[PDB]
Swiss-Prot record:
Biological role stated in the UniProt entry: Member of the two-component regulatory system NtrB/NtrC, which controls expression of the nitrogen-regulated (ntr) genes in response to nitrogen limitation. Phosphorylated NtrC binds directly to DNA and stimulates the formation of open promoter-sigma54-RNA polymerase complexes.
Localization annotation: Cytoplasm
PTM annotation: Phosphorylated and dephosphorylated by NtrB.
Response regulatory domain span: 5-119
The protein, known as: DNA-binding transcriptional regulator NtrC
Modified residues (4-aspartylphosphate): D54
Organism: Salmonella typhimurium (strain LT2 / SGSC1412 / ATCC 700720)
Amino acid sequence: MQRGIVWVVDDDSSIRWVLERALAGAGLTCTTFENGNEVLAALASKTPDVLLSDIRMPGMDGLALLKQIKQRHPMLPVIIMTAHSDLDAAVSAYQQGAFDYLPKPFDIDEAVALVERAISHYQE
Ligand code: BEF
């Protein structure tokens, strides 16, 4: 039993406002960060029920973030907004406890329609 904690990383100010407001309606604490590293820092003192991160900056495009997540977070449900290169890092993400790899489409319909089933498929 948790109080729904969803963490996202993409743009922030724009994606956040939409997600922080929409996700909160369902009954979960939604928060955003720079792209993924910040989360790796904040995550050090708190693990969210579900997490979302971009994939265009880290040495390994984006999946690199997963490589970091799985270093401090044994099994953290991390979802990505895109899968352009280094797909092998994505496969390794599922191995540690990553949800899936979704296309750039995020806003709310796509982002939420996925985050929900994510927790739904985990809460039994
Ligand atoms: F790298 Be993100 F998907 F724009």
